[PDB]
């Protein structure tokens, strides 16, 4: 049950300097990269082309190449239409793709943010502002929705091309997506004890402190933090009085361990 995300960030510093950079995710694994410096989209996995033929990929990459240049000039030209109302620096973010369900089911999305705030989406057959958006965006939306060719193209990207492509990615990337990597844990203190868990994949993990068979409810989980090799890191802390560190252990459950949990005693 996986989500495909194309994330774009564009910074326009003044009227003659900008950059656009993208990365693509399938779940929590990176499948593509496209920096401003590169003319082409880079694969970050062997299976990033999915089940597309080479001609299909070239044609699709070509469209994005046109988009990136056209996108840049359109923002610049929209800023001229609003001014002096809005002004550089401007940051635009896009989050697009689709979530994939069993059967033949999927929802596609295309959300746009302006200065860190979600203001616009593509929905149905047109662009629209969302609740909370400044009403001045109605002029840009009216201008964007005049472009019928962009509309037809985006509809086909979201309704058809995206789910197709992702169904092919899941088949081709099945082995990386279903990999199992073991967590290795270790203890430390500052009283605050700390149970470090690192190297595991996928993301779901259970980590608690234990005096024998009694889950210390004072255990605080931190955020899931990434490692460079596409595995995860997490730490569970427990607050305690000096002298009463005797008997405490850290238990870690994870799908890669196949039943035999890790238990480290202090």
């Amino acid at each position, epitope marked *: 049950n996986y989500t495909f995300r194309c994330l774009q960030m564009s910074s326009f510093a003044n009227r003659s300097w900008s950059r656009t950079d993208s990365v693509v995710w399938l779940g929590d694994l990176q499948t593509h990269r496209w920096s401003n410096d590169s003319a082409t989209i880079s694969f970050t996995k062997p299976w990033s082309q999915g089940k597309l033929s080479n001609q299909q990929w070239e044609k699709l990459q070509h469209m994005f190449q*046109v988009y990136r240049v056209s996108f840049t000039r*359109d923002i610049q030209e929209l800023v*001229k239409m609003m*001014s002096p109302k809005e002004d550089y620096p401007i940051e635009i973010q896009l989050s697009a793709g689709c979530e994939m369900y069993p059967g033949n089911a999927s929802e596609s999305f295309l959300h746009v943010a302006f200065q860190g705030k979600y203001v616009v989406r593509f929905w149905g057959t047109s662009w629209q502002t969302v609740p909370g958006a400044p009403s001045w965006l109605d002029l840009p939306i009216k*201008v964007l929705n*005049a472009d019928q060719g962009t509309s037809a193209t985006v509809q086909m990207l979201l309704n058809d091309t995206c789910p197709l492509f992702v169904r092919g990615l899941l088949e081709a990337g099945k082995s990386d997506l279903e990999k199992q990597e073991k967590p290795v844990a270790w203890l430390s203190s500052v009283r605050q004890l700390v149970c470090h868990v690192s190297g595991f994949y996928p993301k779901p993990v259970w980590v608690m402190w234990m005096r024998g068979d009694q889950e210390q409810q004072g255990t605080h989980r931190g955020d899931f933090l990434p490692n460079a090799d596409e595995t995860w890191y997490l730490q569970a802390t427990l607050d305690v009085e000096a002298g009463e560190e005797a008997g405490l252990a850290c238990r870690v459950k994870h799908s890669s361990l196949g039943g035999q949990d890790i238990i480290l005693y202090w």
Partner: T-cell receptor, first 111, second 113 residues
Framework: AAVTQSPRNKVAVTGGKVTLSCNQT?????MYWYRQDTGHGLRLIHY???????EKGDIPDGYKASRPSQENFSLILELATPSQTSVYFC??????????FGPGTRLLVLE | TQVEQSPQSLVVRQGENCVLQ??????????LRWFKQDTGKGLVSLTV?????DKTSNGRYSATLDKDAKHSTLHITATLLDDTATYIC?????????????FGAGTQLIVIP
């Protein structure tokens, strides 16, 4: 959707001030000034997205622009030169791609 | 220049057909418009083409566009003396007012009556 230009024809001396006005009653936000010289296509000088806006086009040098109102877009040649001898076209449009053209304005600039 | 027109000029006798070429490098290519311009006069739109492979007509004018090739032609059937004019090819790079128009330098047609 009609657009008018004035003057329709004009003779001027080097160093003089020439103003070419374009008027448009379609309530079009957007207006455009072009010059047509032989053996080139029309080239964009200035344009405007609304009252108070003026933007530089491809060949703005020697030309100032003025959008005092939604109706009038003016092209101001402050110090006219012979190289500004040409036929000038104005156009207007809303959010769609169509630019509706005026009938043109012939300018000769003599020494 | 991103829009090229052929021939530069041509002369035909009344009643004859002629074909006018337009080739372009503009990207992207939303639509292509053909204008007619009489000596000392305005731009009259003849037709506008918008599809990947497109065909239009307007009485004795017909036209084609192939966006893959980046090629348009304008056919004029049974020319009349009034067809004496410069014919201009224009490519608009957007489906909205965000676009720029790229103008060919025209083909001069003379019809001998």
């Amino acid at each position: 959707a009609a657009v008018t230009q004035s003057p329709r024809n004009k003779v001027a001396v080097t160093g003089g001030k020439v103003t070419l006005s374009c008027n448009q009653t379609n309530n079009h936000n957007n207006m455009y000034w072009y010059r047509q010289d032989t053996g080139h296509g029309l080239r964009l000088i200035h344009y405007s997205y609304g009252a108070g806006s003026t933007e530089k086009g491809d060949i703005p040098d020697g030309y100032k622009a003025s959008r005092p109102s939604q109706e009038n877009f003016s092209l101001i040649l402050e110090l006219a030169t012979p190289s500004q001898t040409s036929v000038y076209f104005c156009a207007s449009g809303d959010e769609g791609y169509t630019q509706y053209f005026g009938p043109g304005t012939r300018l000769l600039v003599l020494e | 220049t991103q829009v090229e027109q052929s021939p530069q000029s041509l002369v035909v006798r009344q009643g004859e057909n002629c074909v006018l070429q337009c080739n372009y490098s503009v990207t992207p290519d939303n639509h292509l418009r053909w204008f007619k311009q009489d000596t000392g006069k305005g731009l009259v739109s003849l037709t506008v083409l918008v599809d990947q492979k497109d065909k239009t007509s307007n009485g004795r004018y017909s036209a084609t566009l192939d966006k893959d090739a980046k090629h348009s032609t304008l056919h004029i059937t049974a020319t009349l003396l009034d067809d004496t004019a410069t014919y201009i090819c224009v490519v608009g790079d957007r489906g909205s007012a965000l676009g720029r128009l790229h103008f060919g330098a025209g083909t001069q047609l003379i019809v001998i009556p």
